[PDB]
Amino acid sequence: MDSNFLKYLSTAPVLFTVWLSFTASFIIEANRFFPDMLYFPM
Amino acid sequence: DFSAAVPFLKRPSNLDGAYIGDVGFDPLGFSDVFDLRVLREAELKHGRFAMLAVLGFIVQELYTFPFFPKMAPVDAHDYFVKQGGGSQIIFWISFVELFGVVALFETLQGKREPGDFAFDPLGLAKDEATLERYRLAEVKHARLAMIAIGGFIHQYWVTKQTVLEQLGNF
Amino acid sequence: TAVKPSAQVVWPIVGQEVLNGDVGGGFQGVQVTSGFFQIWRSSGITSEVELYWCALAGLIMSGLMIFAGWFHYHKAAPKLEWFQNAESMLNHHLSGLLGLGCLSWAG
Amino acid sequence: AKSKAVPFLSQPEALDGSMAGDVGFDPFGISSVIDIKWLRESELKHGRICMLAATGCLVQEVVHLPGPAFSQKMALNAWAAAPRGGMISILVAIGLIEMISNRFALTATDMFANPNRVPGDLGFDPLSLGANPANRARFELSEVIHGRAAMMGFSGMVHQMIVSKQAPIEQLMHFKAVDSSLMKLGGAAGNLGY
Amino acid sequence: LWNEGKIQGKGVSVIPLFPRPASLDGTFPGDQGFDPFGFSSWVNMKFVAEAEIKHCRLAMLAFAGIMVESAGISFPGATSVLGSSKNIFEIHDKAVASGAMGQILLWVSFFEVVAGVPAMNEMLNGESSRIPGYYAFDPLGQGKGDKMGRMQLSEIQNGRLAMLAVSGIVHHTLITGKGPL
Amino acid sequence: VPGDAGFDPLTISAWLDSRWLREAEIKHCRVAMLAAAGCIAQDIFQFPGAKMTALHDAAVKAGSMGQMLFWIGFVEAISTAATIQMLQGGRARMELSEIKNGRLAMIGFSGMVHHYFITGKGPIELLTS
Ligand code: CLA
Ligand code: CLA
Ligand code: CLA
Ligand code: CLA
Ligand SMILES: CCCCCCCCCCCCCCCC(=O)OC[C@H](COP(=O)(O)OC[C@@H](O)CO)OC(=O)CCCCCCCCCCCCCCC
Ligand SMILES: CC1=C(C#C/C(C)=C/C=C/C(C)=C/C=C/C=C(C)/C=C/C=C(\C)C#CC2=C(C)C[C@@H](O)CC2(C)C)C(C)(C)C[C@H](O)C1
Ligand SMILES: CC1=C(C#C/C(C)=C/C=C/C(C)=C/C=C/C=C(C)/C=C/C=C(\C)C#CC2=C(C)C[C@@H](O)CC2(C)C)C(C)(C)C[C@H](O)C1
Ligand SMILES: CC1=C(C#C/C(C)=C/C=C/C(C)=C/C=C/C=C(C)/C=C/C=C(\C)C#CC2=C(C)C[C@@H](O)CC2(C)C)C(C)(C)C[C@H](O)C1
Ligand SMILES: CC1=C(C#C/C(C)=C/C=C/C(C)=C/C=C/C=C(C)/C=C/C=C(C)/C=C/C2=C(C)CCCC2(C)C)C(C)(C)C[C@H](O)C1
Numbered sequence: 109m110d111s112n113f114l115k116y117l118s119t120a121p122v123l124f125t126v127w128l129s130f131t132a133s134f135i136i137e138a139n140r141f142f143p144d145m146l147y148f149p150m
Numbered sequence: 151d152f153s154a155a156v157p158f159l160k161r162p163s164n165l166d167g168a169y170i171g172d173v174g175f176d177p178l179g180f181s182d183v184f185d186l187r188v189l190r191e192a193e194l195k196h197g198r199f200a201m202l203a204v205l206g207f208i209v210q211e212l213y214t215f216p217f218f219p220k221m222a223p224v225d226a227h228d229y230f231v232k233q234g235g236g237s238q239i240i241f242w243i244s245f246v247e248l249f250g251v252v253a254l255f256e257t258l259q260g261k262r263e264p265g266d267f268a269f270d271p272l273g274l275a276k277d278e279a280t281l282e283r284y285r286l287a288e289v290k291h292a293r294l295a296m297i298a299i300g301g302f303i304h305q306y307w308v309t310k311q312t313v314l315e316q317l318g319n320f
Numbered sequence: 321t322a323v324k325p326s327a328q329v330v331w332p333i334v335g336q337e338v339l340n341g342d343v344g345g346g347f348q349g350v351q352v353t354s355g356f357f358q359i360w361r362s363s364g365i366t367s368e369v370e371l372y373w374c375a376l377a378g379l380i381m382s383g384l385m386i387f388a389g390w391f392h393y394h395k396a397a398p399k400l401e402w403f404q405n406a407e408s409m410l411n412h413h414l415s416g417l418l419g420l421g422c423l424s425w426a427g
Numbered sequence: 428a429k430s431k432a433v434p435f436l437s438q439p440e441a442l443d444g445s446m447a448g449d450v451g452f453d454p455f456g457i458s459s460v461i462d463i464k465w466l467r468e469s470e471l472k473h474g475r476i477c478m479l480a481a482t483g484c485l486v487q488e489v490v491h492l493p494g495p496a497f498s499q500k501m502a503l504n505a506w507a508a509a510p511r512g513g514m515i516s517i518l519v520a521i522g523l524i525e526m527i528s529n530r531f532a533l534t535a536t537d538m539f540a541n542p543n544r545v546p547g548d549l550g551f552d553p554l555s556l557g558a559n560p561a562n563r564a565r566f567e568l569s570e571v572i573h574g575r576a577a578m579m580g581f582s583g584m585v586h587q588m589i590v591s592k593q594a595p596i597e598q599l600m601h602f603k604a605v606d607s608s609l610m611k612l613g614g615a616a617g618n619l620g621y
Numbered sequence: 622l623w624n625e626g627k628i629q630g631k632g633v634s635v636i637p638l639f640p641r642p643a644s645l646d647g648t649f650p651g652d653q654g655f656d657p658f659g660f661s662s663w664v665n666m667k668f669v670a671e672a673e674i675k676h677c678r679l680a681m682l683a684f685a686g687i688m689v690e691s692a693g694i695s696f697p698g699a700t701s702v703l704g705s706s707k708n709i710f711e712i713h714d715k716a717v718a719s720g721a722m723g724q725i726l727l728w729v730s731f732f733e734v735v736a737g738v739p740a741m742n743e744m745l746n747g748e749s750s751r752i753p754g755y756y757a758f759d760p761l762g763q764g765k766g767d768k769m770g771r772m773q774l775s776e777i778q779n780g781r782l783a784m785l786a787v788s789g790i791v792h793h794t795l796i797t798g799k800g801p802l
Numbered sequence: 803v804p805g806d807a808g809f810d811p812l813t814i815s816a817w818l819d820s821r822w823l824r825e826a827e828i829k830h831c832r833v834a835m836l837a838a839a840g841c842i843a844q845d846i847f848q849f850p851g852a853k854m855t856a857l858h859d860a861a862v863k864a865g866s867m868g869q870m871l872f873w874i875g876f877v878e879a880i881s882t883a884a885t886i887q888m889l890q891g892g893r894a895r896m897e898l899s900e901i902k903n904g905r906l907a908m909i910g911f912s913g914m915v916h917h918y919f920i921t922g923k924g925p926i927e928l929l930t931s
Contacts, residue, residue, distance in 0.1 A: 109255060139334060140615075156880065160887050177883035183395070234607045252454050253435055261437060268434035273659030332620040 169264075170282065171289030187257050187264045194265035195250075197292020200299045207302050211314045222312055224303065325357045326350055430454075447564065448571035464539050464546045471547035474574015481581040488594040500594045503585070622770040629653050629774055650769075651777025667753050668745055674754030677780020684783045687790055691800040707800055709791070804894060805901040825885055831904020838911045845924045854918040854925075 116122070139145075153159040153174030162176040169190050176182075180189065207223050214220050221229060230236035256262040265285075275281040302313045311319060326349035330339045340348035365371060392398070430436045432452035439453035441463040453459075458466060484502045491497050499505035506514075525533065528549050532538045539546075552558070557566060584595045590610055591598050623630060631647020634640065634654035641654035644662040649670055660669070689695075691707050704715045716722045740756065743749040763772065794800045815823065841854060861867045914925045921928055 136333060143334075158884050159880070177880050183391075234605070234612075237612060249433065249436075249454050256436060262435060266435060268429075271658075273662065329619055331616075337620070 170285050171293075185258070188254070190264035191254055191257060194288075194292060197289070197296055200295040201291060203299045204295050204302065207299070207313060211312050222306070224306060323347075324351050325353075327352045327356065447567035448575070465535060467546035468538070471571070471574060474571070474578055477577040477581045478573055481577045481584065484581070484584050484595055488596055500597065501588060501592065502594065503588045622767075623774070650773035651781075665745060668741075671741065671744065671753035674777065674780070676784060677777060678754075680783035680787050681780055684787050684790075687787065687800075688802065691802050709794060709800060804897045805905075819889065821889055822885075825888065828901065828904065830908060831901060834907040834911045835904055838907045838914065841911065841914050841924065842926050845927050853923070854915060 151161045153161050155173035155175040156177070159174070159177055161174045162179065162181050164181040164186060165172050165174055165176055169186060210223050210226065219229070227236070230239075253262060253267065257264050265288075275284060305316060306312065309316065323344035326343035326347060328350040329348070330336055330350065339350055341351065343349055343351050360371065365374075428438050430438050430451035430453075432450045433454055436454055438451050439456055439458055441458040442449055442451055442453055444451075446463075446467060487502050487505060488500050496508055496510055497505075499508045528551070529538065532540055532544070538544070557563060587595065587598060590605065591603060593601065625647075626632065629651060630653075632641065636655060639655070639657045642656050642659060642661065644659060645652065645654060645656045646661075646666065649666065687709055690709055690712055693707055702719060703721075704711055706712065713722065736756075740751065744751045744753065759768070790801055844854075844857075858867065917923070917925065917928055923931065
């Protein structure tokens with residue numbers, strides 16, 4: 109892949125959007141498979 | 151100069167015999183805008199899929215595997231959508247197409263011919279002159295098979311008879 | 321006069337599927353207020369298949385516009401004397417854009 | 428200058444045929460972004476864990492420790508049945524082994540600080556079986572190959588226990604084909620949920 | 622013998638329909654061109670040579686066994702415990718059920734594990750200079766020039782013919798449902 | 803330049819490209835040649851499974867005219883490439899004969915279709931009856 113396009117994907121708004129979309133996505137998946145976790149189960 | 155294929159059309163000017171099978175045919179001018187390595191990648195990929203498809207459409211009429219039920223190829227598409235085999239084929243094609251993405255990037259960076267995957271297990275390409283004639287034959291067969299596959303599927307739709315049986319009847 | 325228009329369905333994640341209310345016609349979704357249903361009925365759409373063809377026509381036009389913007393900046397950019405034609409532009413935008421557009425819609 | 432594994436691609440840099448198991452296989456060019464020393468540490472570590480794990484599945488099917496808490500032929504059931512205290516003891520012992528065997532150089536930034544440190548070489552040779560330097564190259568090669576084979580094999584065994592709720596060789600000896608009605612793949616968004 | 626130039630040797634093509642490739646070397650016993658798909662270009666020639674000789678020896682011994690067990694000839698008491706039939710497939714299945722086939726499997730596997738794999742590893746590495754397929758098994762004389770000239774050629778050809786013939790016999794018996802002789 | 807009788811009374815040639823005019827005229831010429839020769843041929847003899855103007859809608863329902871439109875449309879796309887590249891940049895008798903017979907064919911076809919409006923009949927049928 110082109111190094112200037114990879115340097116564009118390393119810019120702050122792209123990495124910020126990708127990282128928090130990934131973060132949002134595994135919170136969504138964790139609350140899909142394990143919903144309503146009001147407490148640490150113990 | 152004029153196009154070799156269409157005498158009254160001018161040569162496109164990005165098509166000076168750089169790619170084998172070039173006859174100067176490009177009226178709508180996609181090579182004046184787009185990369186010819188990418189377009190030859192796509193032409194050879196579409197053509198190889200189509201050549202396999204035409205062989206599959208005919209052989210699947212002649213024989214089918216004992217573990218699978220007998221049926222026509224379009225019904226085979228729908229059956230294997232619902233059965234799980236289609237997902238397996240889609241996944242393994244997608245898996246190979248990942249390294250195909252890497253291959254296309256290598257082609258764009260200049261170090262690979264557009265349809266070359268170094269796939270010569272049986273050593274058929276004995277000499278460079280033999281390879282040139284063979285890839286001309288590959289280009290011609292690929293284009294012919296794209297036309298052919300369209301015909302079989304569309305005719306099957308219009309008249310519900312398979313290609314060998316449609317030649318057999320009428 | 322009984323079914324409430326709804327063209328947005330939510331995924332069930334955090335209890336948010338309560339937003340898929342009973343809009344009518346054996347359907348659950350968010351009630352939409354943009355008036356697209358009345359536009360489509362005035363157009364004479366009468367089926368979802370024709371709505372798929374309209375969605376495809378919009379996608380084809382969207383691709384053609386993004387191609388044209390690239391082409392007219394990077395490949396074929398007009399000179400300033402082309403843009404400084406107010407009489408020609410008005411002739412084409414009144415006669416061609418508005419008049420033909422009204423005529424084709426009337427047809 | 429083409430790859431030997433993938434003949435139509437160029438040979439990746441940081442792969443020079445020195446390492447055992449180096450066949451030029453790096454199509455995605457991970458070695459160009461991640462240092463090859465870290466990658467070989469991670470490959471040897473994954474492979475060793477898997478070698479033990481694959482053997483663990485097979486032996487756990489055949490041989491058991493005494494007691495009802497250890498009578499789980501299917502290995503995925505052993506996870507739940509085996510005593511929690513002892514399983515967390517295993518986890519804590521693994522953590523202590525990781526910090527000591529790496530000599531407190533565990534982070535990506537600090538591991539290999541010492542120029543003497545070699546990828547995968549933790550100093551583990553209790554019986555000095557690698558004392559002979561003539562056997563060194565083929566031992567390194569066969570360790571790498573056993574690790575790769577065992578990664579693939581353990582992955583297969585775990586997901587075949589998921590599909591068929593049977594221990595692996597008992598699955599081979601009481602085989603049942605997939606109905607396809609069950610274990611549907613994907614589909615969470617096609618039906619729009621539920 | 623070798624008969625270099627006439628048969629085997631170098632420059633001899635048994636099917637002139639395929640030109641003899643330059644990749645192929647004229648110094649392997651029972652070698653007469655015949656490389657259509659160009660495998661000798663990239664395969665280890667010693668490994669495939671050893672594999673060819675070993676496949677030859679199984680094919681010959683298997684042919685001898687198929688003929689004997691299809692002529693009804695047997696060892697004493699073998700037909701008592703095994704079947705009385707002459708179908709090779711059924712004899713294999715009942716000799717599997719008797720454990721005899723397991724015993725042959727055991728000892729053949731042991732011979733490969735302790736001797737076949739070291740002979741292969743040394744012959745391919747380049748530490749022993751053992752010619753392919755050689756295990757110093759010449760008890761009843763028959764050595765000297767004839768062994769490395771004509772007998773070597775005889776082993777390779779008779780074995781290739783044995784491969785073709787055994788594949789032929791097993792396929793014919795299955796489709797007909799009846800064996801040879 | 804071929805077929806130049808000096809006949810441009812309204813001087814259209816001053817306010818439209820001469821190449822565009824000649825290509826359009828020769829296309830009109832050849833289309834009406836095929837149409838007029840076909841018009842008489844349809845009454846002379848008939849292809850199996852098968853008037854001047856009504857046949858257009860009798861033929862569209864089968865899908866024949868749709869097919870012929872598709873193939874003419876393909877050729878006309880290559881021909882629009884041809885005319886754009888034309889425009890962006892013992893035989894002269896044969897061209898002149900082509901152009902004269904084509905103008906004659908346009909007049910003849912116009913005649914046959916309006917005669918069809920007059921009597922509901924084809925050309926040579928009208929002559930016979
Ligand atoms: C008949 C001729 C014609 C037509 C239809 C248009 C149409 C348009 N021009 Mg104008 N333009 C013209 C001639 C024409 N121009 C000439 C001669 C000049 C030179 C003086 C300009 C210079 C000019 C400038 C400098 C700009 C425009 C812009 C625009 C767009 C305005 C925004 C809008 O309402 O789009 C939305 C409405 C639509 C209906 C979208 C339609 C998209 C296509 C292009 C319409 C035509 C398609 C085709 C003719 C229809 C085939 C029909 C077939 C199926 C039967 C619109 C597409 C502006 C723009 O947005 O540029 C992109 C702009 O900045 N024009
Ligand atoms: C601080 C030291 C310590 C102490 C006091 C205990 C105490 C206990 N452990 Mg142990 N445990 C320890 C360290 C310790 N553990 C470590 C470091 C590990 C990780 C390797 C474990 C892993 C472990 C497991 C997996 C289990 C226990 C169990 C038990 C309980 C019952 C013991 C019993 O009945 O023994 C009498 C029984 C024996 C002496 C049988 C011994 C079985 C053989 C020796 C196993 C083979 C070991 C194997 C080769 C390990 C190699 C890996 C290692 C080198 C890293 C008891 C509470 C069991 C439990 O919780 O049951 C309620 C249980 O299932 N422990
Ligand atoms: C026609 C068959 C044939 C021929 C020409 C050879 C020739 C050779 N072998 Mg090979 N070999 C064969 C069969 C044969 N072998 C089979 C089937 C086996 C497996 C048992 C072996 C196992 C073997 C080993 C392990 C080794 C050799 C080696 C050699 C070489 C030196 C030995 C020698 O010259 O004595 C050969 C003497 C003869 C061929 C005399 C004839 C004896 C006949 C073939 C016995 C017939 C049995 C029986 C009657 C079957 C017929 C009836 C049946 C249809 C029912 C020589 C190149 C050595 C070597 O240098 O390797 C490269 C070596 O180390 N051979
Ligand atoms: C452009 C003029 C034109 C048009 C619109 C038609 C249209 C029609 N004709 Mg008429 N016809 C024509 C020319 C034309 N024909 C000519 C030149 C002849 C003399 C050979 C005939 C002789 C004829 C008969 C005898 C019959 C028809 C019939 C028909 C109908 C069915 C289509 C068919 O079989 O075509 C037949 C057309 C031809 C055999 C010649 C077509 C001329 C050219 C080659 C076709 C143009 C398309 C071309 C492939 C693409 C453009 C490339 C160009 C540069 C060459 C339809 C009403 C049949 C019908 O339904 O009658 C009831 C019928 O019986 N036509
Ligand atoms: C080196 C290790 C290699 C790992 C290879 C992975 C092997 C298994 C992969 C899937 C196998 C076949 C899938 C068919 C199964 C399949 O395609 O089901 C389809 C499913 C969508 O459902 P549909 O719209 O198809 O519903 C269809 C209707 O028929 C049924 O309702 O696709 C997915 O989105 C599921 C995957 C999650 C997508 C996000 C994954 C997590 C993202 C993490 C970051 C990216 C990682 C890679 C993402 C692709
Ligand atoms: C590359 C590579 C290798 C390979 C390979 C492989 C698998 C090669 C396979 C190649 C194939 C399958 C070529 C097939 C071409 C098909 C054509 C030209 C279409 C013909 C149909 C027509 C014209 C028609 C029609 C018609 C219509 C539409 C409908 C009908 O009602 C009527 C009609 C019948 C008239 C190998 C492994 C050997 C090794 C090697 O070292 C490297
Ligand atoms: C660190 C890391 C690696 C790794 C790793 C991994 C995955 C390591 C996993 C290690 C494991 C699984 C260790 C298991 C230990 C089991 C024990 C001690 C059993 C004790 C049984 C007892 C006490 C009992 C009992 C009894 C009870 C109570 C009551 C009776 O009724 C029953 C019974 C009689 C039996 C490696 C090396 C690969 C690489 C790298 O360096 C990174
Ligand atoms: C180094 C060192 C020493 C040491 C040591 C040790 C502990 C050495 C132990 C090494 C081990 C345990 C190696 C295990 C390898 C396992 C493999 C290759 C399995 C692959 C499975 C496959 C391919 C599969 C599969 C399967 C699938 C998926 C489908 C299934 O339906 C069926 C099937 C089963 C076929 C000691 C401590 C002695 C000291 C010395 O001084 C230094
Ligand atoms: C959706 C669906 C499916 C599907 C499917 C598929 C694969 C459908 C097939 C699509 C294809 C391959 C169409 C091919 C069209 C080619 C044409 C029209 C040639 C035109 C040539 C022309 C105009 C003239 C060309 C010219 C002339 C004079 C001759 C020379 C060349 C040239 C000068 C260019 C299934 C089966 C999976 C079922 C599934 O459940 C749902």
